C-alpha cells in the first residue's frame, strides 16, 4: 500500500476551503465589509472572526490531543515496512503543511497588501485581517504542529528528542501570529503610510525566514525514510 490517497484529501481540503473563503471575501469585501462600524460588518465579518477563532481552538485541541494520545508506545517493535508507511504519512503531513504555508504566507498575505493599498483600513479586524491573520495563519500553525507531533510520536528517527530544524520550522512561522501585535501597533501609532515594506512588517520577515528550517527538516525526513528500507537500489 505505502502512500495512500490521504495526500489527495490533504491538498483538496485546503484548496476547496480557501476557494470558498476567497469567494466569500469577494462577495462580502465591499458591501458589508468596508465600514467596520456598520451593523452588517458585525454579522458578516465579526461573526466570521468569532466562529473561526472558536473552531480553530477546538480543532487544534482535538487534533493535537488525539495525535498525542494515540502516540506509539512501543516504537522499538516497529517493522521497516510499517516505518516506511509512517514515513509516507508524515510526508503527507509535511505536504499539507507546505500547502497551508503557501495559502497563509503568500496568497492571503499579499491579498492583505492589495486590500490595504486600495481601501482606508478602518480597524484591526478588516476582512483581509480576519482571513489572513486569524484564519490562514492559525490553520497552517495547526497543520505544522500536527505534522511535528506525528513525526515525534510515530517516527523513531524523530522520537528520542526534539529536532531543532523541525522545531524552528514549526514555531517560527507560528511567531508570525503574535507578531500581528507589532503590525497593528506600528500602523495605528508608528507609520500611517500603507508602505508594505515598512519596518513595522519586518516581524513577519524575520519569522518568515525560520521556514527555511524546512531544509534541515527534510534532510532529517530523508534520513528517516532511509533507515531500514533505504533500498537497496539507491547506492547499489
Amino acid at each position: 500500500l505505502l502512500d495512500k490517497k490521504w495526500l489527495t484529501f490533504a491538498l483538496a481540503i485546503y484548496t476547496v476551503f480557501y476557494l470558498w473563503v476567497r469567494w466569500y471575501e469577494g462577495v462580502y469585501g465591499w458591501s458589508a465589509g468596508l465600514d467596520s462600524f456598520a451593523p452588517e460588518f458585525e454579522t458578516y465579518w465579526m461573526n466570521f472572526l468569532y466562529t473561526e477563532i472558536v473552531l480553530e481552538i477546538v480543532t487544534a485541541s482535538i487534533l493535537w490531543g488525539y495525535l498525542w494520545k494515540t502516540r506509539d508506545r512501543n516504537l522499538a517493535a516497529l517493522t521497516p515496512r510499517e516505518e516506511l508507511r509512517r514515513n509516507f504519512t508524515h510526508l503527507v503531513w509535511l505536504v499539507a503543511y507546505a500547502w497551508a504555508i503557501y495559502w497563509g504566507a503568500s496568497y492571503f498575505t499579499e491579498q492583505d497588501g492589495t486590500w490595504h493599498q486600495t481601501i482606508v483600513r478602518d480597524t484591526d479586524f478588516t476582512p483581509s485581517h480576519i482571513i489572513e491573520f486569524y484564519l490562514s495563519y492559525p490553520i497552517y500553525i495547526i497543520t505544522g504542529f500536527a505534522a511535528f507531533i506525528y513525526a515525534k510520536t510515530r517516527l523513531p528517527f524523530f522520537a528520542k528528542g526534539i529536532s531543532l530544524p523541525y522545531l524552528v520550522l514549526v514555531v517560527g512561522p507560528f511567531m508570525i501570529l503574535p507578531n500581528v501585535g507589532l503590525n497593528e501597533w506600528g500602523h495605528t501609532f508608528w507609520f500611517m503610510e500603507e508602505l508594505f515594506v515598512a519596518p513595522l512588517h519586518y516581524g513577519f520577515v524575520i519569522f518568515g525566514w525560520l521556514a527555511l528550517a524546512v531544509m534541515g527538516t527534510l534532510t532529517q525526513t530523508f534520513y528517516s525514510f532511509a533507515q531500514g528500507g533505504l533500498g537497496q537500489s539507491l547506492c547499489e
Partner: protein, 382 residues
C-alpha cells in the same frame, strides 16, 4: 468609509471641507463626474500630524471603480504631491470617469506625508453599464493612441511566460533524473563527483550564455522600438495658489463648549460681534463632515449627503438678526443622529478634547460669512 474610526478631535481639527458640489449623482460607464469644493487647513494642526508640507489630493473609493482623469488645487493640475500652508483655504476640482458599475461611496480626501488620510464627506454615486465598455484612451508625444486598460499587457505576459518557461526548463532538465534521496546518499557516502558531469556543464554554460545574450538582445530591441522614453515623473509641487478670501466681518468667541455623555448633541456658548454693515444670522455649524443647519436661516441645495446633513440640527437660543456693531452671547446646540453615527461623541476616548469647526453667517441679501471656531470640548455626565 474609512472615517468614523479616526479620532473625533483629529477629524475636527485637520481640514474643513465646504462648498462641496457633485456634477452628477448617477453616471454611465465612460461618463465623467466632477467633484468641486473648498478645503481649509486648520491653524491648530495637531502636533501628532506632520505639517502638510507634502500632501496629495486623493479620492476615497473602493478601488478603481472610477479613474481619476484630472485633479486640481487652485486651478492647476496636481498629479503629484503638493505643499499646503496651514491656515490657507484652497479650492479643488477632481474629475472622475466611471469604470465599474455599482453604488460607490466617493470621498474627497487629502493624504498628508506624516499624518495619514484626511477623509472628507463621501457621496453615493451610482454607476450603470458594463465594465467591458470602459475605455481609457491616451495619446503619446510619439503620435500613437493606446488604451490604458490593456496597453503592454500582451508584452508583459509574453516576457514573464518566456522567463518562467526558461526557469522551468532548467529545473526540469535537472529533474528528469532522481532528485533527492539517491543524490543525498551519493553526496554523503564518499565523494559525489558523478551526478554533475558533461554534458551537464555544457548545458549550464549554454543556459548562462543564452540568458545573458537574450537579455542584451531584448534590451536592444526594446531600445530600437520605443526609442523615446522618459523616467517616471515625480516630485512634490510647490506654489499652490490659495484662495484670497476677504477678512470676515464676524468675530466669534467660544465661551465653553459641552456635550452630554451619552448623547447626540453638542452645546456651546458663543459671543458673536457683528462688524460691517448688514444684519447677520447664524445659518450653519460644520464640525467634521457634519453640517448642522438652522433651517429658518439657510437651506442646503447642493445635494449634500443626507447622513452628514442636519437640516434643523442647529438650534440657536436667539437667532434674530444681529445688527452691525452689536455684540450678543447665545447658546448654540448642534444635535443630530450623525453626532453618534460618525462617532463624534467618542471624543471622550481621545487624548485631546478640543474641537474645531466653521460657522456660516448669512445676512438678508444672502451673502455669507465663514468664521472658524475652536475651543476645548468638556463632557458632561450628570
Amino acid at each position: 468609509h474609512g472615517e468614523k474610526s479616526q479620532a473625533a478631535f483629529m477629524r475636527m481639527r485637520t481640514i474643513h471641507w465646504y462648498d462641496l458640489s457633485w456634477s452628477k449623482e448617477k453616471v454611465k460607464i465612460n461618463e465623467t463626474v466632477e467633484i468641486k469644493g473648498k478645503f481649509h487647513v486648520f491653524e491648530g494642526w495637531p502636533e501628532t500630524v506632520d505639517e502638510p508640507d507634502v500632501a496629495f489630493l486623493n479620492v476615497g473609493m473602493p478601488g478603481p471603480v472610477f479613474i481619476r482623469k484630472e485633479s486640481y488645487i487652485g486651478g492647476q493640475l496636481v498629479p503629484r504631491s503638493v505643499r499646503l500652508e496651514i491656515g490657507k483655504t484652497y479650492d479643488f476640482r477632481v474629475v472622475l470617469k466611471a469604470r465599474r458599475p455599482g453604488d460607490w461611496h466617493v470621498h474627497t480626501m487629502m493624504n498628508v506625508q506624516g499624518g495619514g488620510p484626511i477623509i472628507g464627506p463621501g457621496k453615493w454615486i451610482t454607476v450603470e453599464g458594463s465594465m467591458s465598455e470602459f475605455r481609457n484612451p491616451v495619446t503619446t508625444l510619439t503620435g500613437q493612441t493606446v488604451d490604458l486598460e490593456n496597453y503592454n499587457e500582451g508584452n508583459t505576459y509574453f516576457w514573464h511566460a518566456f522567463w518562467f518557461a526558461i526557469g522551468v526548463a532548467w529545473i526540469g532538465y535537472w529533474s528528469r533524473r532522481p532528485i533527492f534521496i539517491p543524490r543525498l546518499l551519493m553526496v554523503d557516502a564518499g565523494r559525489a563527483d558523478e551526478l554533475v558531469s558533461a554534458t551537464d556543464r555544457k548545458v549550464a554554460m549554454g543556459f548562462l550564455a543564452a540568458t545573458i545574450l537574450i537579455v542584451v538582445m531584448a534590451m536592444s530591441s526594446a531600445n530600437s522600438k520605443y526609442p523615446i522614453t522618459i523616467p517616471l515623473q515625480a516630485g512634490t509641487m510647490r506654489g499652490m495658489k490659495p484662495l484670497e478670501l476677504p477678512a470676515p466681518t464676524v468675530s466669534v468667541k467660544v465661551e465653553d463648549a459641552t456635550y452630554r455623555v451619552p448623547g447626540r448633541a453638542m452645546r456651546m456658548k458663543l459671543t458673536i460681534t457683528n462688524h460691517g454693515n448688514s444684519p447677520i444670522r447664524l445659518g450653519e455649524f460644520y464640525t467634521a463632515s457634519v453640517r448642522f443647519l438652522d433651517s429658518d436661516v439657510y437651506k442646503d441645495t447642493t445635494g449634500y449627503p443626507e447622513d452628514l446633513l442636519a437640516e434643523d440640527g442647529l438650534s440657536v437660543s436667539d437667532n434674530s438678526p444681529l445688527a452691525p456693531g452689536e455684540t450678543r452671547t447665545v447658546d448654540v446646540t448642534a444635535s443630530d443622529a450623525a453626532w453618534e453615527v460618525y462617532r463624534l461623541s467618542d471624543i471622550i476616548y481621545d487624548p485631546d478634547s478640543r474641537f474645531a469647526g466653521l460657522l456660516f453667517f448669512f445676512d438678508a441679501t444672502g451673502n455669507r460669512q465663514v468664521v472658524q471656531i475652536d475651543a476645548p470640548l468638556i463632557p458632561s455626565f450628570m
